[PDB]
Each structure stands twice: as structure tokens, then as C-alpha cells.
């Protein structure tokens, strides 16, 4: 057990951190525009199933 | 572990519908394919057995698999009434074992035939030439009644593997309310 | 063939600075836009002057 | 495209004057294959020939961003001047000056300046006592000049 | 008739029918009461306007009226279509 | 030719736009806008653009790493 | 119902490549797969398909396979990597339907409860618009037929996504006549005379064969009602279809003056901008 | 190291695939495995292309399920083609498209099962209709940096690499990756059917059923848009008058001073459409 | 395991940070020292009761 959760570690180890921010409004069914916390504005896209 | 594709027949025709043989008819060719399909799976893992039927439409219930779940599953609530098809049910048996994968595996087919069919010679003895020219052994494992003393079966098989043939068989039944394991004592010997 | 001049917008960018005053030796001083100042360099075809 | 325009000279090498008349506008085509074999149309035609149009059309030729269509220059430029020596063209020093300053280079590619060695094996072939010829004295085409030129 | 200059007026009606005057006008209104016709009533000349027959089952010389009349179109729309292709064509290319 | 040429210019925007806010032009194709990461620079601009959609202030979509009017 | 079906190229293709795929046995195949899509609306969506074992023999021509547990795994494997997409139906080849092209819907009604079909050709010798698609409904008839359950035709096209445009209109390369305008169109427009007079030569086709043969098939209900429904609506009349042209007068009037006055004057300015960049660069010139 | 002669073939429905499942899954790269045929030395042919599926949710993570590779190529020995596996793809959806850290380290596992096993990425972003963009390469070792690595035979494909290109990092990149050409082989009879459709199915079913609808557009719905054409055109003009004037005013034709323009060839072309689709009406009404 | 959590901490420079909140949806959302928030939904090696905000 200690290797299954220490193990679920080692797969864990790998995932990547993600910018956090808002959404300004939409501009078409794919362009979406949004605002980053920390300084510039982006212009951005979705998911397939958000 | 020798080489084939056992394709089970079921009888759900409609004279399988009383109970002559010992509690129902299909129980007892349900425990025969019990008893044939942990035979050929001791005979080969590698070889897989799917089902197949006689009844208002030759149905492929179970896709050739090695596996027995489904076949477990398949023999409850076979809808035991129908017409007996044998003519064209040699047909969808062959093309379904042409829809293999391994075709130097064997196409051994077993039959039930617990009815009196309605075949016409010539249709069985261009089936016997088809086969013939078809590389197929099929023993007919024959149950219930039909025409007494069963006929163009006979006909059938003698027609089918004349000169070194070897390869086919016929289990005709016997007309005696006996026990299913006394109908496949000689069967599970040889063919 | 102008059109197919395209890779001259993929390459990079350009600043705008302000200047202050130049010196010698062919140099200026220039105090960009967010930043501190730089002593840089002119190109071939401009003057000094 | 590029064989299209390549056998312009294989089967116009009778007279000289017309390629470049023809291929003045294909010089400077869209992609660098037709500018390529257009290249070596000129160099195959103007062969055996001191033309002065052919060298005016292919002398901006060594300059596009395209490697090998500076190197199908450099083949072409050295197919102007067999055997030429300063009253031919001016243009002997003024392109041995060149391969050798496009070898010497670093920074240029390889198949950029394969063709500098390339013409330089090809100015100095034969130490300069033999030359190639479509043509002989009995208007008969010469076999296998046509042949090894164009499977070279 | 053959439903091009079809529109009735109430004589034939009350000749065929053999009914009075002021009854052909229940009798027409109740077939598109019915939608057995889908027409329409002027009544200065009381003509009862057609624009509309039932199917009826194929005969004869409904197969041949059938052949001859669609042939007769089909040619027809050929004919002007070779010639809007044939006049425009090259500028197609 | 020039129609596949046109579209093949196309692939600049696709989905890493960055939003500036124009600020001059010098004159025909070429500009200065001033992005939102504080800076500001001079850029080329793309012959896609109908002129008249710009030059009094307009956020406008800029290309991240070649930095230019898209 | 279903208001049409939208089929993208990447089926048709994988199509196209499983008659690749059998046509080395040759001898007596016809192409028969399972359709992949998505019910988005009463407008059907399609995205992936796959394949089937499928077999036909001469004798007792009643003899059809569909392999359930294929379609078990493989869906399994389809659904474990894309539980957006799953099944909305089934296709064949389609040189036309044959009599045992209803057993194949009628086994596959238990996955979909509307089980769409569709028909292609793998030989594009169609100058109609292929992938067509029936559905089958029921139309129980006057003459007190039990249940006649026939297939019925929705309409059907070639849709567009993003990635298959570039996919596709990068795959061509070869022909671009359109500069899309007033030309555009005119290929299509020698295209939809031409293509009614193919489906009027199949009209006129098959009246001719229904006296002949079929011992009197002539159709019975559907051609006497829809007959009469084309019997019912050539109209040629005078009284005011004359009076629609002085509507076309004003159609020509609009585009006439347009033309005449801007176009003229645009070109004219053009002209002024050319002769005097043509003259004062003549001046600094020669 | 020893090179050959670079050269990949595709399979049509190949490319789509590549696109369609790089697409649905797009901000994470995701892994698909490549099917086909090692002919020779120097080509390969890939014919089928089969996605794998995904796992937790992290970026450029990849594995090979040997169950599924036996089940799926057991539906395929069940289909009518049985071949085998030539290589695998994924993508690089923000970029200019080269194998990063997580890439080389599958490569370097899965190189020892087969040599020319080439790894791919399609890019559904960086390609709007005038690029595939294909992108293929093939990894070097380390321990033949005493040998050299430059026979490259048919020198074409090299120049030919070099052209499209771009980056500091893919120039940082010719180092462990060298590419190979890829092209483009096809059918006729798909090319014409493909022909088919998208140059008859882009017009619509019967063919006459939207032209006849553009004739009902002719009569109800364009002089509504008559009348904003005939709007634009006096309203654009009174302002467009003053322009040759101002031309005569400022210089012979200097730089931009202002936003508007002339405008009105556009206008003009839908009052073609007017036109053309009024000249319908006779054509389709008629006979 | 630990030659994988060797590859990890072997990199000495340990960017600090505050905990904004902690979601569940089991994931924490996070403001570096240079003020640029960010999200991740594995919270790594630590244990959401020594967590706080
Ligand atoms: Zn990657």
C-alpha cells in the first residue's frame, strides 16, 4: 500500500500547473477572449466538451 | 490440441416441445452441449464454438467464441417452436465458418435434428458434392422423432463422404426415453 | 511573389525608445519605453546629425 | 515542371539565339523549379556558345533565397564558359571569384556550393585541351555528349 | 376536359346533376366542405372556377396520354437545355 | 496561384492571438501599437486588413512571438 | 423523424478504402459496413464508421451475417476513446437495395431505435449527388396490406468541419474554376438542367418498362396521385404570368443603371489615375 | 548515422484521420498508433491509421495497451486487411511542431522493436487549407557521434527538409531528429469521386431544387436588399464624389489620409448576383 | 519511486507560494512570489489537512 500510494505519486509527479483568469466575453463559437490575472489580455479556445 | 471450429446446431423446433426425453428435450441437449463443449475445449482452447439454429430463421445467436458465458446464456428461453430448416442451414453454417480467421482450422459442424424435415434428395446431394468440394466433416447428432427410422439422413451422410471420406458421421437417436449421457456415451467416444 | 514574401512577418519584432541626446563615436542614447536608458548603435543609412 | 523546362535546350540546341529570347520570362518564375530547369535550359543551350544574353539572364540568378537554384546557377555558369577566356566574356574572373568565394564561405549550405566545386571541376576539365560539343563539323548531333549531359 | 380551359359555369353542372339553380352552390361547396375539388365560386356568371381533379386509376389510353405527354416535356426541356449550354458553353471553358 | 497564395498567408492567427491596442501608423504597411504587457513597439502589419476598421484606438490581435499586427 | 442527414467525407473515404480493403477476394462481395454519428437534431450528424463480416451466397439467396460480437468489442473500442461519438446506423455499397437489404435494419433496430441506412457508389459513374440515405417507416395501405415497412429517403449532402476543410480542400489541388461571383453558379446551372433530364429519362424509363414488364407493377397508388400531383401543377397560363415582366423589367432596371453609371465611371478613374502616372513618369522618363 | 533515401507515402484516409483525432482531443497531445507496410529500404507506406485511447489527464502522456493491440489488430486480421504496425503520431497543437522531451523518451523504447518506425505529428492548427502540415522525423543514437552521420542519399530530400523549417529550437532540434519527405500518392477513381462530391455535392440534391430556390428569392426577398443597395449607392456616392476632388487637392497620389474608400465593386457584384439570378427565372420557370 | 522523486527534488530552487483556497472537484489554487495565480488539480506531496488557505 505504501507502493500503491506512493506509486500513485509517481504518476502524479508529471501533471503541470495552469494559468488562472477570467473570461472577458465570447467572440465567435471558438475565439474566446479572456484576461490573465497576473497582466495581458489573450485571445484563446475551449475544450471539445466544456 | 487438433485443429477445428466446432459449430453447435441447437434444436429449437417445435416437436422438441414435449418432454419423451428425460424432464424436457432441451434440457437434455443443453447438457449435451454442456458435455461436447467441455469436450472440444479439453480437445483445444485454441478451437472456439459458436451456435446456431434450425428454427423460423437459421439465427447466429453466439459469434464463434471460445469462451462457454454465452453459450450458458443462449441455451435458456430458446423459443423451442419453429419449423425445421436443414437444407440452407448447412448453407449459413459454412458461410459462418468461412467468416473465420484460421481457415486450416477444421469446419466441424455438429447437427440436432429432432424433426421430420421436408428436404428434397437432389437439394442434399448437391450439398453432399458442395461439401465435397468444401473440405467439411459434419456427424448429425439426431434426437426426438421424424420419419421413423430416420431417412434422407442416411442418404445424407452416405452421400456425403463415399471413397475415404472417414470424417462424417451419423448419430441417429435412439427412440428409447433414456438418459442424455447414455445418448452421448457412444459420441463422446468418437464420431 | 510579394505574397509569398510572408516569411519576413513570421521573424520578429521592433522596439520604439526615445532619445535623449547622442555622443561620439557614432552613438545615441535612448531610454526605450518601460525601461532604463541604452547606449546603442545606428545603422548605415541614417545621420547622425 | 522542372524536366518540362529542362528539354527546352535538348531539343532546341540547334540554334543558340532562341532560349534565352524564350526563357526570359520563366527566369524569374513563381517556385524555384521552373527557375531551376530554366537555369540549366541556358546552361544546356548556350553551351558550346559566348552568348551575352544568356550570361545577362542568368547573371541575377546565383541571388535567390533558394539553394539549389543558385546552385543550378553555378552549373549553368560554368556550361557558358567552356574553354572561354577573357574576350568570350569578361565574366571568367568575375565568376571564378565567385565559386571560390562561395566555397570558402561557411555559412552557406551544401547544396549551395556543390555546384562551386562542381564548376570548377568543370572550368579546368581536360586541362582545358578538351570541351563539350552537341555539334560536330558533319551537323551530325554527337550521341553521347547529348546523352551523358542529360542523364548528368 | 383536359384542364387547361376547365373553368365551369352552372349550366353544365345543373344539366349533369339535374338539380335546380340554388342548389349547385351547396353542391359545390360541400365537395370543398369534402376537399374533393380546390377551387373557387364567381357567381356574375356563376362560374365555378377548377384548379383541381382527383387521381384516377391509370388506363390505357391514360399509359399512352401518360408517355406521349411526358415525352412531350421531356423533349422539350432537352431541347432548350442543349441550346443554354451550347450558347454558353465556351465561356465556361 | 495568388488565391492559394492568400490563403496560405491565413495561418497566422489559428489560436495564440495576443490583444494589443493600436496606436499610430508611419504609413502604408507598417504601424506602432502598443501591447498590454506594458510596451510598446513598432510592427508590420498584414495586407489582409481593410484599412478603414482602424486608426483611432482598436484592440487588435498580435502574434506572439514575431509580435505583429495580425 | 430525421430532417436530413449530414455526411462528412472521412466515411465516404473509409468507404472508398474497405472496397480497397475486399477487393482482393473478388469474386462475390458487395461493400457492407456500420455507420458511426451523432443525433444531433431532427438534422442527423455523422462522423466516424468501420466495417462488418458480411457474406452473400447464390442458392436460397436469403443468406446474411452480422457479427454481434464485433460490433460488441469494437464498439467498446470506439466508445472507450470517444464517448461523444456513438452508433446511429449502418451502409452497403449500394449499387441499388436488393429484397434481403431490410434484415440487416431489422437486426440492428435493437442498437438504434431509428437505425439509418446509407447508400453510396464506389464508382462515381453517378452524375447525380451520391450518399443517398432511406429510413424505414411504415404506410399501411388501403388495400388492408398487414404491415408494408418500407424504407423511405431523407435528404442527404456533404457537410463541413474545420479540420476536414483543410483536410479535403488541401486533397484537391486540382480544379478551381469559380472566382466565386456571377460564375460560380453556371457550371451548376448546366448542371441542374441536365440532371433533370437524367431523372426524367429514368420517368420516362421506367413508364415505358411498367407496361412492358412487371406483369402490371405500374406502381398502383403512387402513380396515379402523384401523376395527377404533376398533372395538377405545369402552369402556363397568360392572364398575369405575362404581367410578372414588367417585374423583370424592373429586375433588368436596377443592375442596368448600376452598371451603367458606376461601373463606367469607376474604369474612367482608373484610366485618369494611369494616364497621369503615365505621362508625369513619361516626362521624368524619356 | 547510415542514411538512405528519405521518402514516406501516406494512405488518403490517413490524413484525415490525423486531423480528426487531433482536433477532438486538441489541447492535450493525444497518442494514436500508424499501420502499414515496409516495403523497401528507403519507403514506407502507411494505409491505415487507428487512434489509441486516452487516461488521465495530463499533457504528451502516452501507452500502448498490448491487449488493445492485440484485439484491434485481431479486428483487423478479421478485416480484410491484416499488416503491420509501421510507427505512431501525435501532435504539437500550439507550435512549430517538434518532438519534445516526453517524445524522444517513447522513442528510444519503442525504437528497439523496429528501425524505420517513423514518429509523426500532425498540427490541426498551424495548417488552414494550403497545409497538411505533415511533419515526420526519425531520432539518432549518441554512439555513433564518433562516425559520422552524412551519406543522405538523393540529395533533393535534404534541401528539400531544410526549406520548411522555421525556429531556434528546431534549428537547436537537428540535432536527434532528422526528417523525412512525405507525399502524396493518389487514386483517380478516389480523386474523381472525391471530385464528385466536392464539386456536385456542394450544389444540392436534384440540382434544380436550390436554383428554383434562388427564382423564389428573385421576386420576394431581393428588393429588400435592393433597396439597401440602392441606399449604400447613393449614400457611399455623395461622399465618394468629393474624392477626386480632394485627389486634385492634396497631391498627385501620396500616402493614406483617411478611413474610407470607394467601396463600391462589391455592392456592384451582388447587384450581378441580382442579375444572374433574375436571368434564372426565365431559364427555370420556363420549361 | 524515489528515482523519480530524486528527478523532482534534486531541483533545488523551490519556487514559494501561497495557498489561495483548496477545491475539490482535491485541488489547490495557487499565487506564486511573482503574482501570477495558478491552478492545479494534483495537489502533489502534500496532504490536504496541513492544508489551510
Ligand atoms: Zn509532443
Redesign the pocket.
Known sequence: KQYEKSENDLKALQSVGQIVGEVLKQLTEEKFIVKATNGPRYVVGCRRQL | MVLESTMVCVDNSEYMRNGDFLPTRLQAQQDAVNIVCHSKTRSNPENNVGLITLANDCEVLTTLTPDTGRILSKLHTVQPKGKITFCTGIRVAHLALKHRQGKNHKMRIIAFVGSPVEDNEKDLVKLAKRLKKEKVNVDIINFGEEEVNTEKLTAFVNTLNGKDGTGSHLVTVPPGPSLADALISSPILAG | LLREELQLLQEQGSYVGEVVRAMDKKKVLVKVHPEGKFVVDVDKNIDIN | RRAAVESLGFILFRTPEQCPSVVSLLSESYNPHVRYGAAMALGICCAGTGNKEAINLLEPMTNDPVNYVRQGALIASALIMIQQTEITCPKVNQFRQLYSKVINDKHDDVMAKFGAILAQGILDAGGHNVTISLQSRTGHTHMPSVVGVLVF | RPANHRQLTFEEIAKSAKITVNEVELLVMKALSVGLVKGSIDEVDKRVHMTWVQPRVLDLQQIKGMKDRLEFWCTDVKSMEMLVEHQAHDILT | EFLHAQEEVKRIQSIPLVIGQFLEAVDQNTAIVGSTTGSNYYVRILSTIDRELLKPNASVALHKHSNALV | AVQKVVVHPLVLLSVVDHFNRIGKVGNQKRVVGVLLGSWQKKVLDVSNSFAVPFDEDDKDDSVWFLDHDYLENMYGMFKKVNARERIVGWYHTGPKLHKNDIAINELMKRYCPNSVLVIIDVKPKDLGLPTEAYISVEEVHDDGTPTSKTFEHVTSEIGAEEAEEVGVEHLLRDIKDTTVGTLSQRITNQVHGLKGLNSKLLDIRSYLEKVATGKLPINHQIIYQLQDVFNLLPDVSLQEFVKAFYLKTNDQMVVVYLASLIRSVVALHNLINNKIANRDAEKKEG | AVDTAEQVYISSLALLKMLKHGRAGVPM?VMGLMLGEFVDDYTVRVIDVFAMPQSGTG??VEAVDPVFQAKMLDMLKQTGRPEMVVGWY???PGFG????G??INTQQSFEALSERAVAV?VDPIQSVKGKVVIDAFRLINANMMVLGHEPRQTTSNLGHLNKPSIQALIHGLNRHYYSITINYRKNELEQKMLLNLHKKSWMEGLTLQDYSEHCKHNESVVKEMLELAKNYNKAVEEEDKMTPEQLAIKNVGKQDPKRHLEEHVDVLMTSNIVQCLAAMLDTVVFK | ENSEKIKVNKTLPYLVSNVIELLDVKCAVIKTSTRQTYFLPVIGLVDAEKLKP
Open positions: 497531445e499533457v504528451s501525435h501532435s504539437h511542431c517538434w518532438l519534445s516526453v517524445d505529428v
